[PDB]
Design a protein around this nucleic acid. Structure first.
Ligand SMILES: O=c1ccn([C@H]2C[C@H](O)[C@@H](COP(=O)(O)NP(=O)(O)OP(=O)(O)O)O2)c(=O)[nH]1
Ligand SMILES: [Cl-]
Ligand SMILES: [Cl-]
Ligand SMILES: [Cl-]
Ligand SMILES: [Cl-]
Ligand SMILES: [Mg+2]
Ligand SMILES: [Mg+2]
Ligand code: NA
Ligand code: NA
Length: 326
DNA sequence: CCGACACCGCATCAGC
DNA sequence: GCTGATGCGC
DNA sequence: GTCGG
């Protein structure tokens, strides 16, 4: 974190634009700048120097000059003192409470943890769980704990059916020493892009994990995507581990590489790679990579047999997972 | 100047 | 119920 | 807020 000060500033700005301004593009603009600056191998000495990086424009260059000279940014100093912005930024920290619901709760006089807790009845299911585990969800997950969780998940999966293949992706697959959550990509020979020869494929797994008390709560659940809560078991007299967020994504086995590519991220890396794909005349999603015919309409899926093939299609040299943390 | 900005599953609600 | 818009987290 | 045509 050579430029931690600047990147934090940019991230706060991005959060403000998303949560308060509800200006998604400025949000992504600030996040891109923060990312490009985060990988810059030099301690930035001026805005001009920063403005040379792609994604850093004139406005951010000036803010960087202000921050470098004063150690702060007036724009953020004001934002922080604004009660409405503070309330909204706080509420959005609760899983399930987005920019809209946050501003809505503020209008109704619900702007603090105390308020949320006493108005549980005004929350949807997801928001309730998010509130319940507010503290825990803010904690990082040590890779050590991620290894224990991977062990439980893969083994429980094998017990349901030896043909399931569960791969932990997200930041974990990228080599991170700590993760915000656990993301599991699941595949089974019965479910391909050609047919679903077996229903409840995801349900079976969720069920087994709850049965052994690994999964404790459910934020949302469908045929191919599960979003919930899990907790490592603790030993006798040992204090309980914090509850953790867990995402499970069931993907057609023949589309594993596009799925593993997507679920490995980062989200910014995917945004960059997907944008570059478009510029190269292709469209990439978690299922396939297809060409972009003149009409702008996507064509038929191109053959893929490894993550590298996807990279080849867009003329990008392969990048190992640990090098996709943008 | 200015249109484009990655792409999608599940939850919830309004209209028919 | 079916469908489409919108929110929220991927 | 930034960038490409
Ligand atoms: O907007 C998004 C979010 C996530 N993703 C993909 C990439 C990301 O790595 C993966 C899992 O999402 P998480 O929110 O779990 N992020 P990640 O695992 O990278 O980091 P973290 O340690 O915070 O969970 O889903 C996107 O493509 N777009
Ligand atoms: Cl500041
Ligand atoms: Cl694939
Ligand atoms: Cl597709
Ligand atoms: Cl996902
Ligand atoms: Mg993750
Ligand atoms: Mg996740
Ligand atoms: Na730039
Ligand atoms: Na939130």
């Amino acid at each position: 974190t050579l430029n931690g000060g600047i990147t934090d500033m940019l991230t706060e700005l991005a959060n403000f634009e998303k949560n308060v301004s509800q200006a998604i593009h400025k949000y992504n603009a600030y996040r891109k700048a923060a990312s490009v600056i985060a990988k810059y191998p030099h301690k930035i000495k001026s805005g001009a120097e920063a403005k040379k990086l792609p994604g850093v424009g004139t406005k951010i260059a000036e803010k960087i000059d202000e921050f470098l000279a004063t150690g702060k940014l007036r724009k953020l100093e004001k934002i922080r003192q604004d009660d409405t912005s503070s309330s909204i930024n706080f509420l959005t920290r609760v899983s399930g409470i987005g920019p809209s619901a946050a501003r809505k709760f503020v209008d109704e006089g619900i702007k603090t943890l105390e308020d949320l807790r006493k108005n549980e009845d005004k929350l949807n299911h997801h928001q309730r769980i998010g509130l319940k585990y507010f503290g825990d969800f803010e904690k990082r997950i040590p890779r050590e704990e991620m290894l224990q969780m991977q062990d439980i998940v893969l083994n429980e999966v094998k017990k349901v059916d030896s043909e399931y293949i569960a791969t932990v992706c997200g930041s974990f697959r990228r080599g991170a020493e700590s993760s915000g959550d656990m993301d599991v990509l699941l595949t089974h020979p019965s479910f391909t892009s050609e047919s679903t020869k077996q229903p409840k494929l995801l349900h079976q797994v969720v069920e087994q994990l709850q049965k052994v008390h690994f999964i404790t709560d459910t934020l949302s659940k469908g045929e191919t995507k599960f979003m919930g809560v899990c907790q490592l078991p603790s030993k006798n007299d040992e204090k309980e581990y914090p509850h953790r967020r867990i995402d499970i994504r069931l993907i057609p086995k023949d589309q594993y590489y596009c799925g593993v590519l997507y679920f490995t991220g980062s989200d910014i890396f995917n945004k960059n790679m997907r944008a570059h794909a478009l510029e190269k005349g292709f469209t990439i999603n978690e299922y396939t990579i297809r060409p972009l015919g003149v009409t702008g309409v996507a064509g038929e899926p191109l053959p893929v047999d490894s993550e590298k093939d996807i990279f080849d299609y867009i003329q990008w040299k392969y990048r190992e997972p640990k090098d996709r943390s943008e």
